[PDB]
Amino acid sequence: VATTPASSPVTLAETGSTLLYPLFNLWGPAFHERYPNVTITAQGTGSGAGIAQAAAGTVNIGASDAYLSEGDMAAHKGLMNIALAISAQQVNYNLPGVSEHLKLNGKVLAAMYQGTIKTWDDPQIAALNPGVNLPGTAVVPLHRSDGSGDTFLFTQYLSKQDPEGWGKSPGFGTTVDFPAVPGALGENGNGGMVTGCAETPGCVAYIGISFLDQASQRGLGEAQLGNSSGNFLLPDAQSIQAAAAGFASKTPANQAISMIDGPAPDGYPIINYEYAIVNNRQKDAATAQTLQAFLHWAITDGNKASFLDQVHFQPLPPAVVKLSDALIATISS
């Protein structure tokens, strides 16, 4: 693995995951400060564009919260997903006056997105939140309009917890045919989800953890999500470090692994690796070497708390760092 960038000016273009975007805005300047000859550009366009453009050769780095499907790998040989850090997703809602962190699970959320739960005081919700005065506000299940990693993560949670329902249809993916129910409205990017949700009381939205602060500032509630052990957790360092322990020794060599709804009793149900989608063959030697240098930097120096703590991510455990490096090292020209 090349740990030093070429000396000639090189530009690494990135695009994709709005979830990973805030972090790339920190990494980019830091690396550039260290190696002035290297220019890093990034844009928040959603995981879909990330996968699409990296595959088309339009950018050097596609950012994605979703791993490549077996189909994607077969269609674009040389394309791989390298883990860079661990992140998570929370479920925000707009219910002014409700102080508590409402408890929800994949079964109840699937019902909301399927239109069977139409109000916030529905029996299925009250059963999970005894003592809370739930309003009769109508539920408005919002979803991402653009191909999104958050959609992939959310719909996998729903699919795992509701195998016979959501699991069968519409299943999961970066783009999903959401049930056409009242309020099934589309919003662009995580920002759009925050903004959309804050707009009208009763909204529900799956939003990436790096937008947690913004969501709170807008006065949105944050749900406690139930895991398979019957526990309801908030996404924080503790619950994510606990959920990751479930897959630290079980990550495949190609790193395509779902860490959704794991077995850790105290683990948060929606965590995931953030991926750099990159092609095994680059423009020239200088560019291949610089991309390697940057990616290895990102998973070592870039994984320090000074960086990750700002967007609420956790670092990759060592065995995984090793696997990423092994993939970084195949980047040639």
Swiss-Prot record:
Keyword Secreted: yes
Disulfide bonds: none
Principal subcellular localisation of the protein: membrane
Gene3D superfamilies to which the protein is assigned, alphabetical: Periplasmic binding protein-like II
Keyword Glycoprotein tagged: yes
Keyword terms: Cell adhesion, Cell membrane, Cell wall, Glycoprotein, Lipoprotein, Membrane, Palmitate, Phosphate transport, Secreted, Signal, Transport, Virulence
Entry's transmembrane regions: none
Similarity annotation: Belongs to the PstS family.
NCBIfam families to which the protein is assigned, alphabetical: 3a0107s03
Protein name per UniProt: Phosphate-binding protein PstS 1
Originating gene: pstS1
